[PDB]
Specification:
This is part of a larger assembly, with one copy of chain A and two copies of chain B. Chain A is mostly helical. Chain A has one helix and one strand, in the order H-E. Classes of the chains: A mainly alpha, B alpha+beta.
Amino acid sequence: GKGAYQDRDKPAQIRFSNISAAKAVADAIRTSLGPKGMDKM
Amino acid sequence: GVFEPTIVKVKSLKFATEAAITILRIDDLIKLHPE
Amino acid sequence: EGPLSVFGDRSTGETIRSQNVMAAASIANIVKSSLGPVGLDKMLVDDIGDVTITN
């Protein structure tokens, strides 16, 4: 369009940090999935 | 005249195999810091 | 390092497997020298001087 300036950038950073944390946990536990997965200590 | 019970060999083999498996299945370690 | 704030130490890969194998090997090597009729004994001393002799 033309206008609707977004003068605040903090929510975008919060959302990206949330995405990063969630993907980090998913990648952490990705290995133990399947009949050929291993254990954790 | 060197003899042993067979239970010694049987039980030793079984326990050794079980311990070897249960240690061989480990992939990663996470140690938490003391409070 | 970085993501996955856990407040602790995590190790993954061949490092942990080698470390576990080394620990098992050290435990075996402690008692390897007391096997068979030609095996010898061991002496153990605590922090107060009490002595135990065994194999």
